[PDB]
Amino acid sequence: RKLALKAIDWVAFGEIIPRNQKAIANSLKSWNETLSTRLAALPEKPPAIDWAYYKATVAKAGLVDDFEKKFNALKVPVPEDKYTALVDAEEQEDVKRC
Amino acid sequence: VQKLFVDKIREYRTKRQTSGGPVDAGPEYQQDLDRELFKLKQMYGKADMNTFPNFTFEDPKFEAVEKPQS
Amino acid sequence: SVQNMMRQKEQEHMIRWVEKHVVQSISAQQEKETIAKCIADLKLLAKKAQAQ
Amino acid sequence: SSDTPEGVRSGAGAVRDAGGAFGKKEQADEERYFRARAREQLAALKKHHENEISH
Amino acid sequence: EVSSILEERILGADTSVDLEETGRVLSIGDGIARVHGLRNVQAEEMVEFSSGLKGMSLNLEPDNVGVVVFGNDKLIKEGDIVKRTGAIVDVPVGEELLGRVVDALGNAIDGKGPIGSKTRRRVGLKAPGIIPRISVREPMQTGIKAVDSLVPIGRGQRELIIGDRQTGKTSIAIDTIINQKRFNDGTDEKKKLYCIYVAIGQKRSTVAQLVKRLTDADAMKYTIVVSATASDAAPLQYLAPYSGCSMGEYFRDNGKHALIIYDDLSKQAVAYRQMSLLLRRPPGREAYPGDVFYLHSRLLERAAKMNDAFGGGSLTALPVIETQAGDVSAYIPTNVISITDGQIFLETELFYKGIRPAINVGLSVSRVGSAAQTRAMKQVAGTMKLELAQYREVAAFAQFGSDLDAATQQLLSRGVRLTELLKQGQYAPMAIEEQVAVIYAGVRGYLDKLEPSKITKFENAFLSHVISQHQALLGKIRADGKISEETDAKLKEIVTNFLAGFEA
Ligand SMILES: Nc1ncnc2c1ncn2[C@@H]1O[C@H](COP(=O)(O)OP(=O)(O)OP(=O)(O)O)[C@@H](O)[C@H]1O
Ligand SMILES: [Mg+2]
């Protein structure tokens, strides 16, 4: 899999200082603690699919193996990254204003 | 007791010779295990015999806000 | 869960036929009773030599 | 007695379960006090103005 | 291939003839057979009747022998034949029983298959003496914040769970089975634990709900359950405590560790009283026989901490005892109190006042003391035990107190907030490194300004923080065992950083 690190969420990242908007900065740290535990719930690799024991234990053949032939060569397309760029776009304009 | 033993082995092989399946069960064992599995498959799940599952999921729209500083 | 559950249904129905069918088959074997006495005592002849 | 697990110890709500003098003095004091609060809460409940227009 | 395995068994069966030492039946009634004959039976020897039931001969009288029946007496007619087996009662034992449901005699009731155990063991063995024992030092982790703080349990101690009906006596002994999953899937061989659970006279539907609770938490691959239910005969609820120690002594004899739970021992003294008064034995106080102390003593003395010359094994015993109206001064609640080491006294008043688990720490003791706590837990809980004990002196001033000294207002202020740390939901057992951090947040003084209703919400927020963002500190209290000066400062800014921005 792939996993990149981050910076320290210690002093600055919870003190964004909006117009008395400490609640929006508090919600920003609350998403990092939730997703890091959901990443700690499941590993990077899933379980392995034993194919040889499937043929003998489910030995009524045809209908068992045809689903196991179609679901084996499938693909899982992850969601889009369209909102990933526009949120990073407003950081470029505000850093020029800061 | 071996002569009693092979008498048992004879009656297992006449029980092997089947053409209609359950001879002594009748409708009693046929209505039971058909209703027993369907009562258990209702607790198990509605899945087909060969339909492989495939779907997709929608991630959250990462929105932004404004904050005027400097 | 269907291939292994239904196997136990005819595993019990197998023995449900035999043990009611043995007693109707050995009830007329009185010609086998005259050797059943003659095979018992030779095991007893084998048995009484153990303590002696 | 009570300075060990073996001996008898008293719980909460043991004056009313006895039913003596203090158990009867407590029931007639919760009633003679909350009888006057059924007066002041019912007299001020007649001060709804919409009912008076119906009157 | 269903016909082939049935033909396989009957040729593999043994049909051989033997001798016997039989004796006719005189008078069967209420589950006590009187047999005339059987001139060479030992005491407590298993016989078997003509129908198929088995029997254990308890009274060796001159002209007859009194044999209890393992079943129902409607199949025993006067004039039957009582053959002899020739052996005292023995149970299968080994590693193969792990993850099965067994009755009091080792048969399989869950319907997976027969036990493949190659060994066999008697149930009437003795305890080890004084020489093969050593003092208890290792901790047995329960996972309850009030047990490991104030009434600890070592690995070889007997601890009694005493209380009334419906106060969470079964639930305290059901998450102690769940909590040992974190060691039982790892690598450290001398920290694993094995749990056995004995149900004595409960209904079959309750045991069928508790196996599913332990199947859900993936905690039925190292647990055995011995079920002698309510419908089963009166002597099968007598053997079943002694049929579990014989499975918990195979792990003590071979250098391993174990745990056993008797649920409950107050239904064994009743199933044994019925067997006595039907055999015409002299009664005593509350119609119990003269040897009900000798019934429970030689079952709890089999729990021992062995030394290194014999293997280093252990056996830990937790018996459950149900009192009636909170009177521990009855007959059986005073036998088992004077045998064991300490009690955990769950009240019913604290259960409805919000304190759950409702452990009364005023009456709960443990006489192995602080010698079974780790060095981290011992340092913080030694002041907490002194702090809570000063609160219980002044609990009677809380209902009308505002005109008191500022020390007394402080003693009330810390006692309420230490109590909220002790409450805990069901089926959530914690770790010792997470337990010591929450106690350290409270006993130092970092909570006397937070509102007493928020102490639960603050704790669930703080624990999920330090698991993900301070994982490298909870590996230097788990592996170190103690809490040093480097970790004392490192934990100090953590609870000051979280408390500063908390309310959001
Ligand atoms: N920590 C807890 N918090 C809240 N509820 C609990 C807790 N522990 C147990 N309970 C509840 O208490 C109820 C009864 O508990 P439990 O059956 O363990 O008591 P018991 O005295 O062992 O029962 P019995 O009297 O049948 O032996 C259960 O319904 C359970 O949901
Ligand atoms: Mg219970």
mmCIF file of C-alpha atoms and ligand atoms in Angstrom, chain E residues 166 169-171 202 263, ligand 2:
data_model
loop_
_atom_site.group_PDB
_atom_site.id
_atom_site.type_symbol
_atom_site.label_atom_id
_atom_site.label_comp_id
_atom_site.label_asym_id
_atom_site.label_seq_id
_atom_site.Cartn_x
_atom_site.Cartn_y
_atom_site.Cartn_z
ATOM 1 C CA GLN E 166 -28.683 -9.622 39.805
ATOM 2 C CA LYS E 169 -21.334 -11.316 39.475
ATOM 3 C CA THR E 170 -21.338 -13.264 36.207
ATOM 4 C CA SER E 171 -20.357 -10.163 34.223
ATOM 5 C CA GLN E 202 -28.375 -22.910 35.288
ATOM 6 C CA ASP E 263 -20.593 -20.301 38.851
HETATM 7 MG MG MG F 2 -25.441 -14.215 36.989
#
